[PDB]
Design a protein around this ligand. Structure first.
Ligand SMILES: COc1ccc2ncnc(N)c2c1
Lengths: 112, 381
């Protein structure tokens, strides 16, 4: 094996980032449930549109938190020999981008 | 909380800084987020009002209701050429109230307007609080700085912002005067000294020439560019990288706002690296259409991309010397202020202009103006 103590520092940074992504992802899931809650709820059609648009501040905050994670990930410089670090970084960026595309779907379904 | 000392405040266009003289030294005070400078930003939302870091951190979420650049409006009439040109570029509204400008926002679901001095009073309240949190004592006395070119109305409106914030403004002093005080240029033995202050930071470029004689400061001339700073240097790097992505991948990333933002954030940080290293590396995974962007830039390439902008900083210097009726050989002291003066090419262009004369630059250039204001606040105590 060629696994170095230096790579452990980078993997520890990436784990922390994966932990923050899970927390933002939990907020996106609570927003998805609240959106469904309005759609399958007791309010009439007009008040439903207003309740849905009230989630705009919250979806924009989730999008912003995911953008700040990408910016933090973009500060990392990982040598070619840091294979596990590079695989973990790429997997995290792709995961965040798939979450960003779900946020965009929510944005396209509110305040229309 | 018992009574505390007097502080010095640099109330800047995009950022503000507060310092205190204690134990024979100036200490620049960190804010609640551990930052030695605080954004001159105020945000209005559906539930609250936010100041500093908390306001700039949500600008992308709420651009229309987040105010900054109040200093560009303070003490001005609505029909001022500067107000008219500037507003076109701000996401927030600027309205006319009986000849005076007001920022108009949506706050707690209502349309509300504020005068520039009310916005600046909120930033000053935050600077006051920052000082109090560190000292664990009440802060009332302050020296607040203004540009040397500010007129009667702009100086009075700044003083009113201090008054509304509950501050006893001991003195309103010019930013180049505070920078000269920071380096103790007024304590040097001899005859009259001619000082040039080159200030490149906050998004503004100011050149001032002063004369100091037995503790008395006189402004001889001012010159510069109101819209020149680090963002312009970052923009050139963004343009360069966008062109590079087209050459390598035959794809245009410029219409994707998130890809441009990721590239822009990494360019700002690479620029900072290039002030102390000769090369910077950037790695951005899945930047656009799943393409990873791994690249580098040398200091020399960064200098070539900004060559006209860097060279152009000398025109205001030439102009300032002409209006002061001084030759460049008559300048006793040159002071560097503002974050962008850390750029080695700028320092080189200025030193070569003054035929190899050493520059005053040991004080953090982002903090130098607050440093001088803190010393002055202590001398006035
Ligand atoms: C705040 O720290 C820095 C460091 C280098 C820099 N180099 C160039 N421009 C800056 N504003 C800058 C700021």
């Amino acid at each position: 094996g060629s696994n170095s103590p230096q790579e452990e520092v980078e993997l520890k940074k990436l784990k922390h980032l994966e932990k923050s992504v899970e927390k933002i992802a939990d907020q996106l899931e609570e927003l998805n449930k609240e959106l469904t809650g309005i759609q399958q709820g007791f309010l009439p059609k007009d008040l439903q549109a207003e309740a849905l648009c009230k989630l705009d501040r919250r979806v924009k905050a989730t999008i912003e938190q995911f953008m700040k994670i990408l910016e933090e990930i973009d500060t990392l410089i990982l040598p070619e020999n840091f294979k596990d670090s590079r695989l973990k970084r790429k997997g995290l960026v792709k995961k965040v981008q798939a979450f960003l595309a779900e946020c965009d779907t929510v944005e396209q379904n509110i305040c229309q | 909380m018992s009574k505390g000392p007097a502080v010095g405040i640099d109330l800047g266009t995009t950022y503000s800084c507060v310092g205190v003289f204690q134990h024979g030294k100036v200490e620049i005070i960190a804010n609640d987020q551990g930052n030695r400078t605080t954004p001159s930003y105020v945000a209005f939302t559906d539930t609250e009002r936010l100041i500093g870091d908390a306001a700039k951190n949500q600008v992308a979420m709420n651009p229309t209701n987040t105010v900054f650049d109040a200093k560009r409006l303070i003490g001005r009439r609505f029909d001022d050429a500067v107000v008219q040109s500037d507003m076109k570029h701000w996401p927030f509204m600027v309205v006319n109230d009986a000849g005076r400008p007001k920022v108009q926002v949506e706050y707690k679901g209502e349309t509300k307007s504020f005068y520039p001095e009310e916005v600046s009073s909120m930033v000053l309240t935050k600077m006051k609080e920052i000082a109090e949190a560190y000292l664990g004592k009440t802060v009332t006395n302050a020296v607040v700085t203004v540009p040397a070119y500010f007129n009667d109305s702009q100086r009075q409106a700044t003083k009113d912002a201090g008054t509304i914030a509950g501050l006893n403004v001991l003195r309103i002093i010019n930013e180049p005067t505070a920078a000269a005080i920071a380096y103790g240029l007024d304590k040097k033995v001899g005859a009259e000294r001619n000082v040039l202050i080159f200030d490149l930071g906050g998004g503004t470029f100011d050149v001032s020439i002063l004369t100091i004689e037995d503790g008395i400061f006189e402004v001889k001339s001012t010159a510069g560019d109101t819209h020149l700073g680090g963002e312009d240097f970052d923009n050139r790097m963004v343009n360069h990288f966008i062109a590079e992505f087209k050459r390598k991948h035959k794809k245009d990333i410029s219409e994707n706002k998130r890809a441009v933002r990721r590239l822009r954030t990494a360019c700002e940080r690479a620029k900072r690296t290039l002030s102390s290293s000769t090369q910077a590396s950037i790695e951005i995974d899945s930047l656009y259409e799943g393409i990873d962007f791994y690249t580098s830039i040398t200091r020399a390439r960064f200098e070539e991309l900004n060559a006209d902008l860097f060279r152009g900083t000398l025109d205001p210097v030439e102009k300032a010397l002409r209006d002061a009726k001084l030759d460049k050989s008559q300048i006793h002291d040159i002071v560097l202020v503002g974050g962008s003066t850390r750029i080695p090419k700028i320092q080189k262009l200025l030193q070569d202009f003054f035929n190899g004369k050493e520059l005053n630059k040991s004080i953090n250039p982002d903090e130098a103006v607050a440093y001088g204001a803190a010393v002055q606040a202590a001398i006035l105590s």
